[PDB]
Amino acid sequence: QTVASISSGPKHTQKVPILTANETGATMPVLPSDSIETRTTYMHFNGSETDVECFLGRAACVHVTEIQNKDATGIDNHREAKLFNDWKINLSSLVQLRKKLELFTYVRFDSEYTILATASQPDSANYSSNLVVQAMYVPPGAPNPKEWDDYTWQSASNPSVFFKVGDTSRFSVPYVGLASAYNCFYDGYSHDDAETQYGITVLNHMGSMAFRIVNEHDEHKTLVKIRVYHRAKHVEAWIPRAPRALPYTSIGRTNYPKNTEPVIKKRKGDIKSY
Amino acid sequence: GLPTTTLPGSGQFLTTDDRQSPSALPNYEPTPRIHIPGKVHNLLEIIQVDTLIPMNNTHTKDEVNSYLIPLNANRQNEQVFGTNLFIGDGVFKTTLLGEIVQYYTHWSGSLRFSLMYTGPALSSAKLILAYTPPGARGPQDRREAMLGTHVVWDIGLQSTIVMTIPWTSGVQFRYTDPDTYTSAGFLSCWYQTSLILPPETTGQVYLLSFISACPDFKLRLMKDTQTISQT
Amino acid sequence: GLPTTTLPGSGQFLTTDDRQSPSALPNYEPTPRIHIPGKVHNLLEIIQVDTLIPMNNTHTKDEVNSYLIPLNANRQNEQVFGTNLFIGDGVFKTTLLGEIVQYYTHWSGSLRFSLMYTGPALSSAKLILAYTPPGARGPQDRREAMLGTHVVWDIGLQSTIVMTIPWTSGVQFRYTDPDTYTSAGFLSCWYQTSLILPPETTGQVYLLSFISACPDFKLRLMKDTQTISQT
Amino acid sequence: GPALSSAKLILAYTPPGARGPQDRREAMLGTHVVWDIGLQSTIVMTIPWTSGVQFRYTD
Amino acid sequence: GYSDRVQQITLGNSTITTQEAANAVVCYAEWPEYLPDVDASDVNKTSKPDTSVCRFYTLDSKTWTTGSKGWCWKLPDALKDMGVFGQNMFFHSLGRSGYTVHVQCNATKFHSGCLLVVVIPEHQLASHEGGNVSVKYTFTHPGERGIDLSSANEVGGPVKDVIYNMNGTLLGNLLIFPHQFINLRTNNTATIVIPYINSVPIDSMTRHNNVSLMVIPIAPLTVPTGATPSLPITVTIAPMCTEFSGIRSKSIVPQ
Amino acid sequence: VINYYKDAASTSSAGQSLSMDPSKFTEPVKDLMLKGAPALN
Amino acid sequence: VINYYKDAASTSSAGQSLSMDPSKFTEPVKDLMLKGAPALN
Numbered sequence A: 001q002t003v004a005s006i007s008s009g010p011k012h013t014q015k016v017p018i019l020t021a022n023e024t025g026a027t028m029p030v031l032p033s034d035s036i037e038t039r040t041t042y043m044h045f046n047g048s049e050t051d052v053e054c055f056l057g058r059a060a061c062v063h064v065t066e067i068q069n070k071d072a073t074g075i076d077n078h079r080e081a082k083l084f085n086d087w088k089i090n091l092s093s094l095v096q097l098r099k100k101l102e103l104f105t106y107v108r109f110d111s112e113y114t115i116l117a118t119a120s121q122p123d124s125a126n127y128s129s130n131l132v133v134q135a136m137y138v139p140p141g142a143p144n145p146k147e148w149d150d151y152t153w154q155s156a157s158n159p160s161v162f163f164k165v166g167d168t169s170r171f172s173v174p175y176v177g178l179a180s181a182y183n184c185f186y187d188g189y190s191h192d193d194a195e196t197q198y199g200i201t202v203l204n205h206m207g208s209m210a211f212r213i214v215n216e217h218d219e220h221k222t223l224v225k226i227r228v229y230h231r232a233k234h235v236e237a238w239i240p241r242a243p244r245a246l247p248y249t250s251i252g253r254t255n256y257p258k259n260t261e262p263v264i265k266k267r268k269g270d271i272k273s274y
Numbered sequence B, C: 001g002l003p004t005t006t007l008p009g010s011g012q013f014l015t016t017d018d019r020q021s022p023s024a025l026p027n028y029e030p031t032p033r034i035h036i037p038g039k040v041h042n043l044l045e046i047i048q049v050d051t052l053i054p055m056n057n058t059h060t061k062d063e064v065n066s067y068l069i070p071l072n073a074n075r076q077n078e079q080v081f082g083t084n085l086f087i088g089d090g091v092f093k094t095t096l097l098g099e100i101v102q103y104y105t106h107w108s109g110s111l112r113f114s115l116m117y118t119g120p121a122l123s124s125a126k127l128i129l130a131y132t133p134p135g136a137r138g139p140q141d142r143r144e145a146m147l148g149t150h151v152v153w154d155i156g157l158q159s160t161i162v163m164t165i166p167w168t169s170g171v172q173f174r175y176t177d178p179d180t181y182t183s184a185g186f187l188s189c190w191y192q193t194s195l196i197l198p199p200e201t202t203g204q205v206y207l208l209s210f211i212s213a214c215p216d217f218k219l220r221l222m223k224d225t226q227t228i229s230q231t
Numbered sequence D: 001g002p003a004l005s006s007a008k009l010i011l012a013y014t015p016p017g018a019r020g021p022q023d024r025r026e027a028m029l030g031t032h033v034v035w036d037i038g039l040q041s042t043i044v045m046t047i048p049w050t051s052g053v054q055f056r057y058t059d
Numbered sequence E: 001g002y003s004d005r006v007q008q009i010t011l012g013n014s015t016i017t018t019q020e021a022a023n024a025v026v027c028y029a030e031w032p033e034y035l036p037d038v039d040a041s042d043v044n045k046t047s048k049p050d051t052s053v054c055r056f057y058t059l060d061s062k063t064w065t066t067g068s069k070g071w072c073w074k075l076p077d078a079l080k081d082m083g084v085f086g087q088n089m090f091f092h093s094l095g096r097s098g099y100t101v102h103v104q105c106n107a108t109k110f111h112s113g114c115l116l117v118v119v120i121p122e123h124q125l126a127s128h129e130g131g132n133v134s135v136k137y138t139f140t141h142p143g144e145r146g147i148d149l150s151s152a153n154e155v156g157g158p159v160k161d162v163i164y165n166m167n168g169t170l171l172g173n174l175l176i177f178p179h180q181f182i183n184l185r186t187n188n189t190a191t192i193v194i195p196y197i198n199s200v201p202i203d204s205m206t207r208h209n210n211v212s213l214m215v216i217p218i219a220p221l222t223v224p225t226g227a228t229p230s231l232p233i234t235v236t237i238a239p240m241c242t243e244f245s246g247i248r249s250k251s252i253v254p255q
Numbered sequence F, G: 001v002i003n004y005y006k007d008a009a010s011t012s013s014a015g016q017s018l019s020m021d022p023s024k025f026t027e028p029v030k031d032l033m034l035k036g037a038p039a040l041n
Ligand SMILES: COc1cc(CC(=O)c2ccc(C#N)cc2)c([N+](=O)[O-])cc1OC
Pocket: A089, A091, A111, A113, A137, A159, A173, A176, A182, A183, A206, A209, B024, B025
């Protein structure tokens, strides 16, 4: 099919393809056949695995949180006791997927979530309880749960999923951005104010995901850890940028740590060392 | 009820599978697409754009100077710089090419290495870039280097020289992670004649080096990168 | 037996899924449909009907007066009322529009705001309604207000003025939940000339304000409302 | 000036109604030309007829 | 008879000429254009001042010394006080625009130096304080003076290590953004045409800067023996296909 | 490839774009530059 | 969309009505009123 290199022989002309001027801002498509004698070879390659659809198309962990099943008697702040918990939806908490997404400026896609819940009984327990988890999506404007047993968990309009601990939850969500694409970066503010926040933290008000355990308490305490995975599908990306070099310090902002190790390796020897 | 038999694997979560799943927001109508310039479809598109190589990574910390290759006046046949070609490490590790290359296990194809002269217009010079394919050591003197793939560059009106590093290998794919069997060879530069400065000129002269991929290029087996962590 | 592999998610109960399920009452024959007037197919149909806005929500408790906007005789260029345009809160929160809007996360489109004069027939007045698009503060005097979208209303035989609040935004959707980035701006009303009463008339004059959506309107991402609870 | 010298100047025409510019910024806001001294030695800036009445007095 | 070296650009009543350019860059190969009906959302009929705002505005010249780190401007911020363009920015709720950036710097055939001139869409700056500190409105709205990368940090401001592009990415990869170099031995000017790049059809021109322009010395300046150890750098920008929408009272911004 | 679900978001991955045009990044210059011809004429 | 069950109640959701006529609520007046013409003539 496609040729990787054409057959090219000796050369002696005034057409010098290897002499350019990089200050123009262009990367002239020079080939090996332009500076050496080559033979014919074929690609036998389409580059399907480097398509943005494939690059962002696999599940990556985007959040880990914890909730627990125990007696709620006396507990004043259920949220703090972790009788139920929150997740202010965002994809820049765990760095692996974040660096990939931030290889672009604007990004548009549907999301496929997979939520894994694992039980743990650190203290004395006679058996492993069979708990059912309820993950409810709380869009901005919806009433937030205050107690693991609010009226809010009725979830009449909020979408929510019920699944066994140890099992996995799965569903997809359409592209919910308010604009035509999501912003990986935002050089702006919410309004013209002297103190207001800067960055995409201003655009990322996606709401929360409330997690709880439907079962009443058992004699012992059970610790359920929840892991949320995200896979993008039907991907579109715009304006590629320089890859993240320094470590992250916060969700949403480009801030980097003070006093960080150099990122570029230093030669063990000369600039002439191999 | 249709008789079925569940196969091993049932229940597993393979982060790589690609199946259908119910939508949690039925009937939701996403925002219309509008035109946005600069759409990217494949990473192979962008690694063809060259970026600066921090060739002179001889400093105590990261700095603009790491990208400046010093060139000295009236030096003759001497070496200007050298480096092995493990594109997933060394000087290349932080470049756009190196950064993207590290998101994959295998690579193949030809590299595009170029040098742009920044010394005064009234100065002159002739350098020689050389690619030494695997099998022998990195050249130790111009003669040794010149015996392999090379380009004699005449500094002039056209400021940049583009030397291609033609895919020279037996096995048709190399590992991005530095591996001896799959080593790519060495890159070196020497003085063909010398750098000559005009009168009233004493300032240091520098070279800027760039690295990019040719359409030749291929990357396989996506994997996580060692260039980011937290924790 | 047909070989199958169960995928992650199996067993889950997604309150939003839409699948088939066996009928617990097989062969049951439901009652025949008869004609019933007033059928509703879409909530977007009903939010186009306007309802009264409790603009004057300055009282100690809820009351009919909350809907009466006081207008004063022989006042000149002074402000009659003001409000931001967070339709999912403030004065709008209890209106049919606000109530329905709160069942969704996103909204877009144009609003229909109208005022009906109730003062004596033999009285006269000229007011000016004004919409101030986001980016600047709520107008502090008529001049400031008049510089943006507005309507000069002449009280007369036709009792109601209908000022539309044209969709004025960059991003094509705003949040129903009050959010700064997606703020809609401000609505204000002032005296263009003044209210004039006829002889033997001293009673207070009021305005009734209504709010509804234009066919322009759109609502997305259904969610629970903060307007009801128990537990 | 000598061939081996360089320079970039800016000529500016300020139509009637305001004062003669007192600093480059003020001047640049009206009709102007950024001239790059080079091989072509002469820059030609036209002063386009900018007027309400269609004729002016020479006096 | 023609050449990439010699060029003329005329917008409105302003014209710039150069006899030592190196072609010109058109970001992502797209020329600026007006907002088409199919992509529009805002129902307001827009305003197109045309020639009165789509012209070249020249900022204060910077001084390139042997120790300069670089400079960073932001658009439309950099032109907020420029004639009618600026006025329209504050009187309207929304607006969109493209630009033609022209950076000038001439020396002699004896000098040497290489400036990187790049346009970065959505250049979200980082706080030098690290952690999760923000960058106050004032500091990302320097106006035509722009940000000097060799100046000291300041409370509420952004970090300024040229090396990390003020955002945690390495300088060397800035080339993935539409750019051009002003290499004194070749160049005299750099020209970049910027089309409107945003995830929305139109936006606020005061609370959001669409792109930032950076002029960064890579190969340091060197002058001939006994010559003044500095060269001026001048930036001239012209908006194009500018549209304003939602006119109201004039906006009041932080400080 | 039978879609069991009603919404588009439910469907699986899109499949290779097969567009692949790097020139908008590698050659975003105003005046076309031919390989072999003087970069700066 | 193959119905596995015998009864109608078993089938899934109906899909958009696509009727959308608000006038029976917004304009339930006896004498037609044209936009632009005097509401009260
Ligand atoms: C499974 O958990 C959910 C997650 C989300 C958030 C979402 O899909 C999203 C993805 C990427 C970006 C970016 N950039 C912003 C938001 C939504 N949601 O937004 O509606 C609902 C969820 O459960 C209905």
